[PDB]
């Protein structure tokens, strides 16, 4: 399937406390593999995967250097952004950044992207062309001009098209046993008489990987996205996720409702009934 | 392609591999697509001895990447003071201007590298150099909160 190397960086001005908090997390697909925290004692990128720990010290040194370059850069960004927006120091603001390269089943360069957010709002994004910028506002317009002059897009292109893919392929060779997996959701029905008249059937899915799953209701040929509540997919912390959906249904229904499931783990779907 | 191996080695820091590759005849000034040089990689990595072995190999001290950054720029931003000094002794252009108009002095000021600031000033860096925005290093210091550097630059004007 498609695979992603995803890097998330966030920075928060902490006025008076005197240093911004900086968190960096890298993911390969849905598996957190590296981290950084300004407030951790290590001051180093730290392995979160048994594969990544095979990576030797030269790399951890280099990633420490690069993540501290991210830290200083995001610091000065914080200050420049609060310059562009003309807002007083006396309050916390946040910067966050996210970039990565996606590959298809052949592991060729599928797609790269880069994004930037100030104060939780979208600020700048690399267009899929990797050559032009979607500015959000006159401040982001300013940064667009500066990055155009600096040719930042050529840098980003060279990275996202090049080393990103190389590293991603290596990690997938090393995560041969943990990122290549798929775990098919286990599922169960539950029945509750939520009132003297009304009941609910609730269909559970859990212990599946990757997170992408769909569950839906039908009255055997009619749409039941009506009397239905749904929750976001959630992590078990086993390195796996959970979700459930329910239908508000009359008691004593003649097994008319059914839970339909689709997940990449199921070569034959496993729809099942009360 | 010896240049790719030399670039990688300077990125990885195999100082012995650096020396052997230079001996084999790798282009010291080999250029990447983005025009970054082994000198830029060595500045970034803080590989002092690799820096010196490249410079003795006649590395173009003032080579500009596609962003217009010189190795001096990289060193200044990242704080690799000994590299800064070795570059300057090698003849690095203290006033070299990138495509944005930033000097290394700009970067040192905005990143708060006071020691490097002082070395640059002793090397003839222009305190008054204005970027494309018109911003002096003093401004960038203030904006970054490096008040002591800000006042050093304003006093050194």
């Amino acid at each position: 399937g498609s695979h992603s190397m995803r890097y998330f960086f966030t920075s928060v001005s902490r006025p008076g406390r005197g240093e911004p908090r900086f968190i960096a997390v890298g993911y390969v697909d849905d598996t957190q593999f590296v981290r950084f925290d300004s407030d951790a004692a290590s001051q180093r990128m730290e392995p979160r995967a048994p594969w990544i720990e095979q990576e030797g010290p030269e790399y951890w040194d280099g990633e420490t250097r690069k993540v501290k370059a991210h830290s200083q850069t995001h610091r000065v960004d914080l200050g420049t952004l609060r310059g562009y927006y003309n807002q007083s120091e006396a309050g916390s603001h946040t910067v966050q950044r996210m970039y990565g390269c996606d590959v298809g089943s052949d592991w060729r360069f599928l797609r790269g992207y880069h994004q930037y957010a100030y104060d939780g709002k979208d600020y700048i994004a690399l267009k899929e062309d990797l050559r032009s910028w979607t500015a959000a506002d006159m401040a982001a317009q300013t940064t667009k001009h500066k990055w155009e002059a600096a040719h930042v897009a050529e840098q980003l292109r060279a990275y996202l098209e090049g080393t990103c893919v190389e590293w991603l392929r290596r990690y997938l060779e090393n995560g041969k046993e943990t990122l290549q997996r798929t775990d098919a959701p286990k599922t169960h029905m539950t029945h509750h008489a939520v009132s003297d008249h009304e009941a609910t059937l609730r269909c559970w899915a859990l212990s599946f990987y990757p997170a992408e799953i769909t569950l839906t209701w039908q009255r055997d040929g009619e749409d039941q996205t009506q009397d239905t509540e749904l929750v976001e997919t959630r992590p078990a912390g086993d390195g796996t996720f959970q979700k459930w959906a329910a239908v508000v249904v009359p008691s004593g229904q003649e097994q008319r409702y059914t839970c339909h499931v689709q997940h990449e783990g199921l070569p034959k779907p496993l729809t099942l009934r009360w | 392609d010896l240049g790719k191996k030399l670039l990688q080695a300077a990125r990885a820091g195999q100082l012995d591999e650096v020396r052997e590759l230079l001996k084999a005849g790798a282009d010291v000034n080999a250029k990447d697509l983005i025009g970054v040089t082994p000198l830029h990689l060595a500045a970034f990595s803080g590989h002092l001895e690799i820096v010196e072995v490249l410079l003795k190999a006649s590395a173009d001290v003032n080579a500009k990447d596609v962003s217009g950054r010189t190795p001096l720029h990289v060193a200044a931003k990242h704080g690799h003071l000994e590299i800064v000094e070795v570059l300057l002794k090698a003849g690095a252009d203290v006033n070299a201007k990138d495509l944005i108009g930033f000097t290394p002095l700009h970067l040192a000021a905005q990143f708060g590298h006071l020691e490097i600031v002082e070395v640059l000033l002793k090397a003839g860096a222009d305190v008054n150099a204005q970027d494309k925005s018109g911003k002096t290093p003093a401004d960038l210091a203030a904006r970054a909160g490096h008040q002591d550097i800000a006042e050093v630059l304003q006093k050194a004007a």
Partner: peptide, 9 residues
Amino acid sequence: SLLMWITQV
């Protein structure tokens, strides 16, 4: 690997 040459905003 992170991006080696991030630019300031």
